Design a protein around this nucleic acid. Sequence first.
DNA 1: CCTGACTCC
DNA 2: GGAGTCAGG
Length: 546
Amino acid sequence: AKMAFTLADRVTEEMLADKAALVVEVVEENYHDAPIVGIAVVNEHGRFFLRPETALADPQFVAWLGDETKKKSMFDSKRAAVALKWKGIELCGVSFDLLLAAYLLDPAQGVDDVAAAAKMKQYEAVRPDEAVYGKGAKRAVPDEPVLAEHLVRKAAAIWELERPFLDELRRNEQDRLLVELEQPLSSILAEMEFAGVKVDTKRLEQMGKELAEQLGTVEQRIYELAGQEFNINSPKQLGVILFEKLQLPVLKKTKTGYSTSADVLEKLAPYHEIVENILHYRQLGKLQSTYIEGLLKVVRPATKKVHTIFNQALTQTGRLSSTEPNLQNIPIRLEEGRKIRQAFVPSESDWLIFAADYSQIELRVLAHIAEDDNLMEAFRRNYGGISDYGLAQNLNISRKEAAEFIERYFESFPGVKRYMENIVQEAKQKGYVTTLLHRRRYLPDITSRNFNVRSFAERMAMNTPIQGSAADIIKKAMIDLNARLKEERLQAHLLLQVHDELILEAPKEEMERLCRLVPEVMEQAVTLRVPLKVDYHYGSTWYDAK
DNA sequence: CCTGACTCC
DNA sequence: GGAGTCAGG
């Protein structure tokens, strides 16, 4: 563990080389408007640590950051790019991202620091972040020399690991997936996160006021029907009321007690009317706790914007996730919750929300992969590997009839059935399954002698190529769309992605254009054996974009 | 801190 | 099948 570096007082010319590993350290998990605590640069000329108060107010260093011809290798470049946006500084020329590289090589490793990626190539001259900063209430930036060494060591690790990682991606035929898809997408996501979505707090607060009143009413009705006050939000207490006091049938148990899941309670409706009120209550309570209160807590008060973080290197299938707040699970199914969407508005006057969604993309993908003629044919002119039991329990119907449904289904679509058998066998033979754009998922459990473990792995083999291919497609669609927007000099920009949906905002005058441009780009992102179809709507709020 | 609830794709 | 947040405990 011996590594020389320069703890620099000012920026020098040799730090501004046209190829470098760069670390712009943001310690807080949520990097929006978060402090940059230190900077490290490793290049042909040496290793350098820089104070941010120094470097970020240096016109030549800012210049170098924003020069796309000066190439930087980094880890989680979106974190840096966004943290720098909040400092009023543009980051360009990121040519390698070790986080995304590690993610593509094996999503299951859960790589989320440089040390964890270095471990994939037995590189151990760098520490885990948690070891340096500590955890929870003990989390702290260490003394300068200790911080400086850690940052340089992370930069030095990125410097050395780039080629070994690119080399393995290439051998996997995933180099283009990184360089032409994930990396360009990262910059697009950074733009969306920094832009944020404006919220109508006056409307959200009034909705919360009315919701609190309604909750109270439902709450009292529940106590009356139960004959007792209890905590409805405690499955344990609720279980005692339903299955002991009221002696309702026990349909299901988990490891901690009686189940009170929505499925179960719906099945108990013929026994007592309290179960319908309880379901209603728990829906309203989630609206209040999460989509009123939890959302207001994360609104930036001066601008009324919420800024999500799209985790690009988390899910096992290639999807994004969205955190703090999650803007990919805003209610829509019930009118009561859907009204939440009225609080999501355009960031400027006389702008509108535009939403476009793929129709049944996973089913069209399956049609392509399996080359099922009947399914391909139907599309030219159901999501349930569900069993006869789950189907019966889902439709509240006969398990015998459910069995017959699945049987008939595979009769009609023998190509899908063939595919399901073949992809499982391939997974056992190779140890992983792959998506259209060569994303991979390893399935080491697929030959377990244990039935449950093996079965779950086989269902991943069936689902991951379909769900992951759909993720591939929409990611490419975002990249294509961005370019087309910039080419035509539209003011419209992306705000959100919701798996198979893109949400933008734009001047009212641009709807006519987007109505043609967005769907076309999305549909032409890849060419399958069946067509892609996209639906679209625009409005004064997210609610009205329907 | 985990579990089981609601929310979306 | 893939996710995140919340209250309760």
